[PDB]
Design a protein around this ligand. Sequence first.
Ligand SMILES: O=C(O)CCC(=O)Nc1ccc(Br)cn1
Length: 562
Amino acid sequence: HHMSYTWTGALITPCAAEESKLPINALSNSLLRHHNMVYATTSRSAGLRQKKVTFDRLQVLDDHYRDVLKEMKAKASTVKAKLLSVEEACKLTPPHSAKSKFGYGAKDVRNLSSKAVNHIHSVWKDLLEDTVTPIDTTIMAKNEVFCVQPEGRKPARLIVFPDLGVRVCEKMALYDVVSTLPQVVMGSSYGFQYSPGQRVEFLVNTWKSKKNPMGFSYDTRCFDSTVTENDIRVEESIYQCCDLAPEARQAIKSLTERLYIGGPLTNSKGQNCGYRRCRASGVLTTSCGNTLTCYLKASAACRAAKLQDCTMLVNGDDLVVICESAGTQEDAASLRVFTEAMTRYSAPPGDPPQPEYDLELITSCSSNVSVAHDASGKRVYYLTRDPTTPLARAAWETARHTPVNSWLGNIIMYAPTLWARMILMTHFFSILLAQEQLEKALDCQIYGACYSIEPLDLPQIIERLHGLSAFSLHSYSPGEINRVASCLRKLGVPPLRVWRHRARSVRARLLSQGGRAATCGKYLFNWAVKTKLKLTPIPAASRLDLSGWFVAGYSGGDIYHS
Ligand SMILES: O=C(O)CCC(=O)Nc1ccc(Br)cn1
């Protein structure tokens, strides 16, 4: 038996009171009236999740798999990675990261307190000295907000993470590796190197490079749970191809053996819940490991399937392939073979993949390409998504402060979209104005890494990522308009015409404030007025240090970039 998990029967327990019901305040109804459609996951559904993610994995590795791996190792051998100092690793820790079980917290780490630093040193020495003893981890149910899907509720996802002292050691050994290796190994196929605009450009340029394009997304069922001991050792063998300090080689070996491959699961109350033999969701290498393993299995599966001129785009477990169509009959056959190959490699599908011949209909990283027009009438492709989950989360954040402000990450990632501009920007600027909180930095997440961002810097941040056209887009596609309008009806959100009316008020209110607030009024809400102002490059935008923003994925990796 090669079971993903074994369980003792102890429960996955909360740390505090969990709310599942949408909190309601005086602001809630201005955004969303169908309150019973919005919920948060809690530890109450963790048992259901346990059942889904617990299964036997079989793996049959053929020559396509070994050929691809050999090519990947060749590329990896060109990477030179450095050790981070303790201070550098400490400064990457989020201020509100989970405290150590050993008497210090994230703030002590960030401040380089003698107690934190001495313990980190001792964890580091232990990693060098011992390469066998499984490292303890905490298992928790994530509290995440969704809209009910009648087609009702998702069980909580699990997060599995080692102690704070270990997490700092991971950064020291592996931050530079996980930040640099994936793009070297995968080239343009590595999704996390792209802003949303660069993602769209890569997908558009790829689609146009095929004589008769076909594309598909591949949805692996419970990817983390499909990741086998073999997979994690193969990831380590790729890491070791790098030019590394010998102390780094040893830490990486030790972390692989003791943490990455598996280990005991401890609940919040300190009881043993069981044992993991698959990917831990809360380690530094979760994103890089998943991306490498997905790309390996998929590249080999493409060879088994004989897909012609295939181009992959991989972001963790999220995979899209664009290739040369062999007619629609051979295309469907090819996907069945690809799927069979993936399954043999232990990556079976959730929903079976389907050939797509319209780029705008391929969803990947929950997103799709769509088309609008810029100020000169030119067709412009941009990244959008179904706004259901963004709006459900915004409703929650309307009434509750949360560690991660999804609305702000959403504005940043989806600035050019109809729904971020009309609803998210309007709603939240209105709240910030009222509470005089425009100048207060808020934490958000981009590709899993944490950023502290002042809302007043949004115009500059958006110009830098999306360009000035994000403030000028118009004539959105009927399909996009209709999906947005349909989502509002579903959630009981007021129609766009209401938001336009509200935005004129928000705009005027921002302009009245002068300074950076007026700039927000001017740039972000130019769409709301008939007498449209000329938007010109913002001098402040070029001064913004946006390095590290779209370099790598860090989901579960405990990374803070501010
Ligand atoms: O195509 C036009 O100019 C009329 C409809 C249109 O695109 N209006 C619009 C533009 C941007 C935003 Br945001 C909302 N509505």
